[PDB]
Design a binder for this molecule. Structure first.
Ligand code: TRP
Ligand code: MG
Ligand code: MG
Ligand code: MG
Ligand code: MG
Ligand code: MG
Ligand code: MG
Ligand code: MG
Ligand code: MG
Ligand code: MG
Ligand code: MG
Ligand code: MG
Ligand code: MG
Ligand code: MG
Ligand code: MG
Ligand code: MG
Ligand code: MG
Ligand code: MG
Ligand code: MG
Ligand code: MG
Ligand code: MG
Ligand code: MG
Ligand code: MG
Ligand code: MG
Ligand code: MG
Ligand code: MG
Ligand code: MG
Ligand code: MG
Ligand code: MG
Ligand code: MG
Ligand code: MG
Ligand code: MG
Ligand code: MG
Lengths: 16, 122, 120, 56, 209, 114
RNA sequence: CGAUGUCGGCUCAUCACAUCCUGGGGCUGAAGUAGGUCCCAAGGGUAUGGCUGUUCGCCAUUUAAAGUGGUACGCGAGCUGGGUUUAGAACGUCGUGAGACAGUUCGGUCCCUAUCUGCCGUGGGCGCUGGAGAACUGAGGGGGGCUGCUCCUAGUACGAGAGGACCGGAGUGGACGCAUCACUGGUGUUCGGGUUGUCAUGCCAAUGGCACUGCCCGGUAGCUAAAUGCGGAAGAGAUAAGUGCUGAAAGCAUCUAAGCACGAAACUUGCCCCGAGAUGAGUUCUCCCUGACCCUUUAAGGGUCCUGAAGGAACGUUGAAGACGACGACGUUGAUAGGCCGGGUGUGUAAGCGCAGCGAUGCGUUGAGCUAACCGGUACUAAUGAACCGUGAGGCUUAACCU
RNA sequence: AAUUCCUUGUCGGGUAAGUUCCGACCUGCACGAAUGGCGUAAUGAUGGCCAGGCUGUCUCCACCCGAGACUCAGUGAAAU
RNA sequence: ACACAGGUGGUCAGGUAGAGAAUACCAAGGCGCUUGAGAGAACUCGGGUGAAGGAACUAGGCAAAAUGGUGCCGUAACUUC
RNA sequence: AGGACCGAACCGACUAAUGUUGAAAAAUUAGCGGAUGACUUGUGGCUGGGGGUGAAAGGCCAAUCAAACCGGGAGAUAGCU
């Protein structure tokens, strides 16, 4: 499946 | 060892009763005052009559510290509590006129003579 | 950081250690030989040899102490009657540690410890 | 933290330059029984420094 | 001038008439016997080489022994040089006592610091300790950042980091000499010198005022 | 500590009487008052004692003019001169630190009388 | 755009100099105290708090000072997650509405075991031209470089007054640093004692387990700071801005073109530490090896028997040395560790027996009993007789001494 | 003001010092009466502010007891 | 997906203290959890104690620390009583 | 008497640290809420995909949800990589 950090929004969204 | 914040009792009239150290004067970053050093002070308690009133900002002389004092030979004097004598902001020099509780020999200063002249001990 | 400290830890806590060297002192004073790891063996000395010494003088008290440690009346008994007098004249060093070395299951470094006059 | 390139077969070997073992040499003989043994250790039979301790 | 080799027996007060406690390290200073003199001829420099203790015969090697052999032997603990400066000494185990410091007021003293073995920052370098609390995740005594970003793109040399601490040379300097006592081989210098009890010490008159 | 010890006991007072935690000793200490070198008396309860040869000290607790003061004398110091016991305390307890939490009538200690 | 994590704080930094303080100067509308401004200077130092997410800023109070900038507006494979920024919700606002806002409002998961470079430590290998044990030389590198106040000079110089010096002394501080446990103390689950609940040792009495070390009072060594010693320097060289001497080019003037003197926390040193892988592998002292013999393509050639040193390593007992390696002490001709003897220190009058008492309990024997890592001693135990590694006189050339 | 941009508005209070808080003013950028207005005892793992106690949260970190980290033996992964 | 610190309804229920099926120590009974042995570093995890100070920390007292039982005495604004 | 009070079982999931190639695809430890009620629980039943159910979050409908899963149209179409 996918690692938790990839699914998680705060770490992943990082630069909008 | 007195340091910013820290309540002190007062060993004179003037009428302070409870007082808080808001600065250890005498040097950049100086951590502690003790022995017979000078500190800036904000009155927290104050009797109703009294020379001083609550909220005043003055200086004062550490006269008893619980960590006490050493001097030569290796002995120690410790006092159960922390007390000071209020000084007028310009002239140092007690604003009070009577001293209470014992004071120590270290205080044998030109400016602090009036304290040991008063004061019933050491 | 250990400078001048004394007393091994054997990866236990004070409690466990205390009870173990108790069971072991027994196991030694009883059988007069035991097989055990060299570290455990060496420490055993600082438990046992004092007991034997203590026994060299018989009194009610000295027994009752030898019972607060060890806690086995059979061994406070073997001391005092047997080991006490049996060494009454010996300066110290009632034991000796002989090393066989390297237990199979865990490669632990091994050794025998016996009462020094075992003879039997 | 992970490699960016496969370490080589060479590099592997290098790292193992120190992983090699030492023999013994200090193997020594009992004065009574014949017996090879580790120095300062009981022999197979239970001899050590000539004397026979341990029946086993 | 030169100085001597001693042994820290260490640390006790001596009281004075007018009532003051002078903490002193007690340095035992057995006579130092010059094992060799050195000269601009046998290249280099002017220095003397002493030994002081006593050593087990079965511990003294052939060479060490042969070296002691030239001049009055009785092999000591070790050897130490002191550089010279218009003072002179002949090698026949000249033997130098604590006599030397009768008139000295100074003295510098050098030991081998107690061995802390590790420390890491905080102990080693007085680094500050991160929030003990307040959300800190596994970073309470850690060193924190150790560089900038791409542009140094490296850690600079000599960065303060965790590692071996103590068990190294260190000397102290100044140190008033309190008492000199020949035929007792004692030297009381005022307070605290590096290294542990029993360890070897080198004392020399202070280089600073 | 064999070469010490020697250096030490050759400084120790010998006249020191025996006291005991609980006793109400009076220590008379030298003091260069200002111009005069006089004696000054400190009288209080012995609340803790040393017992380390030359380095022997003890702590005396006074309760002066309101709240306490404690003095640790190094017993073998010149500045002490005189020390006499003045009352015998019944405590069974080596350190009387608990007295600090007491006050007056609550802090009295029985005579030892034996 | 098959991901280049972002404000602020925290921790740690590092450079620049357009220098905040300290240092040296010129000018001053520089009397003095004290300012202003420009020049030189980057060695070191360069605030705690209130409010706010802040940076900032305002305010309080300090200080010699609270410098301006670069470093992915340094620093999230170091921390935080308050701000902006996920799905919830509401206000105001816009919109018929879904919804929306650099409007506001309350609530939400920041992973990565370090291969490489770097960096802090610490070993192994080989080299350094016979081997070996020490002691060195010091190319080179790193560390350190802060400053207040009081007293004397002197109420003198200066100034109508008020006020108040340079220069030079002497003490004593702040922050920082190194070291150390003698003092003062912290810790002290390995010492002693008190005490609650309960279980057990047959029972009384005395003891042990478990309850956070059950709770707690003390506390030995060690480790330690708040504890107590010490440090920044003096001096020397060459300079910066600057001031000069002498002095022509240019009869004069001129610090400069020749020549000479001053001159600062910057520079080179002095102080402390590392340091011969300094392959440019250095110096000094000491110790050790003085057998035979064969083969070929005959040369820094290979080998056989004898030999096995100085020393090293291994092993053992080990250390105020230590992650492991390493480093130090010792191995019976022995105090290396444990034990043991005596002492100390801690605790604070054991158990047993007696006395008083109805009893709880008190007293006597008794400052008893017990007492770790301490001290001084002591071969009782354990450190074996040996084995192992390491060799057997150490290249060529030239020169200088001698043969 | 869960609504105020200008805004840390202004005045009063608390603090040595208060962009928050409590009380007011009204100039309501852009409250308002069942997409309810204004109050309200009690209740709340609700939001903001204050004080006593308390303290290793901090000044500033020290020591200790345990589990890892380190060494030996056995087994033996991972992303890239 | 595992000899997985998780989830799984009903039944029985001793002693000492205790209000108690809380809690602590036990009985009957059942277990020591399928790597161990040494070391006594940094750091990390979980605990204990701390001179003087006492919120100065920080977005915020986050976390820790403190309070803690029974009987009696006694208890303010306000209140829908 | 009580959607009454304190508090275990039982039901919950407010804070923190740990864990994040876990012991665990959502738990552990210390604290926390409810605990005679709109409580909680075993067994069995009914509701079906633009449909269910929803004290309402776009929640849940088998570790899947702004339209479940399985097979089919099927080699959908892809001016894009
Ligand atoms: N257990 C995860 C949280 C988590 C689980 N599944 C996730 C999926 C997406 C984001 C986070 C998660 C953690 O370490 O926090
Ligand atoms: Mg010892
Ligand atoms: Mg226990
Ligand atoms: Mg986490
Ligand atoms: Mg932590
Ligand atoms: Mg680059
Ligand atoms: Mg990436
Ligand atoms: Mg400039
Ligand atoms: Mg940035
Ligand atoms: Mg937020
Ligand atoms: Mg005048
Ligand atoms: Mg005049
Ligand atoms: Mg009984
Ligand atoms: Mg409001
Ligand atoms: Mg509407
Ligand atoms: Mg509710
Ligand atoms: Mg392994
Ligand atoms: Mg299993
Ligand atoms: Mg299972
Ligand atoms: Mg239970
Ligand atoms: Mg297991
Ligand atoms: Mg293990
Ligand atoms: Mg404290
Ligand atoms: Mg506040
Ligand atoms: Mg702050
Ligand atoms: Mg604050
Ligand atoms: Mg809390
Ligand atoms: Mg708690
Ligand atoms: Mg209810
Ligand atoms: Mg309830
Ligand atoms: Mg689902
Ligand atoms: Mg297709
Ligand atoms: Mg088709």
């Amino acid at each position: 499946t996918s690692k938790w950090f990839n699914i998680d929004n705060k770490i992943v969204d990082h630069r909008p | 060892m007195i340091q910013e914040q820290t309540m002190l009792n007062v060993a004179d009239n003037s009428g302070a009763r409870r007082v808080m150290c808001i600065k250890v004067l005498g040097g950049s970053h100086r951590r502690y005052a003790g022995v017979g050093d000078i500190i800036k002070i904000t009155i927290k308690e104050a009797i109703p009559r009294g020379k001083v009133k609550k909220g005043d900002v003055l200086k004062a002389v550490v006269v008893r510290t619980k960590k006490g004092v050493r001097r030569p030979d290796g002995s120690v004097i410790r006092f159960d509590g922390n007390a000071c004598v209020l000084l007028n902001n310009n002239s140092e020099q007690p604003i009070g006129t009577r001293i209470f509780g014992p004071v120590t020999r270290e205080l044998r200063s030109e400016k602090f003579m009036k304290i040991i002249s008063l004061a019933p001990e050491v | 950081m250990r400078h001048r400290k004394s007393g091994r830890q054997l990866n236990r806590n004070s409690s466990h250690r205390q009870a173990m060297f108790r069971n072991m002192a027994g196991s030694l004073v009883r059988h007069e030989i035991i097989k055990t790891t060299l570290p455990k063996a060496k420490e055993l000395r600082r438990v046992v040899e004092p007991l034997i010494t203590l026994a060299k003088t018989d009194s009610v008290a000295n027994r009752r102490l030898a019972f607060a440690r060890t806690r086995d009346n059979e061994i406070v008994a073997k001391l005092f009657n047997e080991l006490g007098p049996r060494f009454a004249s010996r300066a110290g060093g009632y034991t000796r540690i002989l090393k066989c070395g390297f237990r199979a299951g865990d490669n632990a470094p091994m050794a025998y410890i016996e009462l020094v006059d075992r003879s039997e | 933290a992970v490699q960016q390139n496969k370490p080589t077969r060479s590099k592997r070997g290098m790292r193992r330059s120190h992983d090699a073992l030492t023999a013994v040499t200090s193997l020594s003989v009992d004065k009574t029984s014949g017996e090879k043994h580790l120095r300062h250790h009981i022999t197979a039979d239970g001899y050590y420094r000539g004397r026979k301790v341990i029946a086993k | 001038m030169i100085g001597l080799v001693g042994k820290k027996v260490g640390m006790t007060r001596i009281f004075t008439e007018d009532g003051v406690s002078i903490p002193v390290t007690v340095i035992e200073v057995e006579a130092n016997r010059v094992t060799q003199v050195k000269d601009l001829a046998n290249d280099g420099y002017r220095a003397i080489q002493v030994t002081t203790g006593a050593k087990k015969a079965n511990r003294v090697t052939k060479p060490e022994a042969g070296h002691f052999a030239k001049a009055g032997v009785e092999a000591g603990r070790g050897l130490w040089e002191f550089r010279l400066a218009e003072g002179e000494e002949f090698t026949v185990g000249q033997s130098i006592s604590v006599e030397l410091f009768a008139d000295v007021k100074k003295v510098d003293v050098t030991g081998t610091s107690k061995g802390k073995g590790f420390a890491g920052t905080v102990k080693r370098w007085n680094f500050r300790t991160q929030d003990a609390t307040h959300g800190n995740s596994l970073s309470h005594r850690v060193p924190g950042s150790i560089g900038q970003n791409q542009t140094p793109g490296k850690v600079f040399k000599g960065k303060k980091m965790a590692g071996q601490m103590g068990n190294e040379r260190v000397t102290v300097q100044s140190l008033d000499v309190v008492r000199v006592d020949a035929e007792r081989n004692l030297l009381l210098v005022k307070g605290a010198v590096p290294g542990a009890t029993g360890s070897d010490l080198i004392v020399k008159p202070a280089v600073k005022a | 500590s064999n070469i010490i010890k020697q250096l030490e006991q050759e400084q120790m007072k010998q006249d020191v009487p025996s006291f005991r935690p609980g006793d109400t000793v009076e220590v008379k200490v030298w003091v260069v008052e200002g111009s005069k070198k006089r004696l000054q008396a400190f009288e209080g309860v012995v609340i803790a004692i040393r017992n380390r040869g030359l380095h022997s000290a003890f702590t005396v607790r006074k309760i002066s003019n309101g709240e306490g003061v404690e003095r640790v004398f190094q017993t073998h110091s010149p500045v002490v001169d005189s020390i006499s016991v003045k009352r015998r305390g019944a405590v069974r307890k080596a350190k009387l630190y608990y007295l600090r939490e007491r006050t007056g009538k609550a802090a009295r200690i029985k005579e030892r009388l034996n």
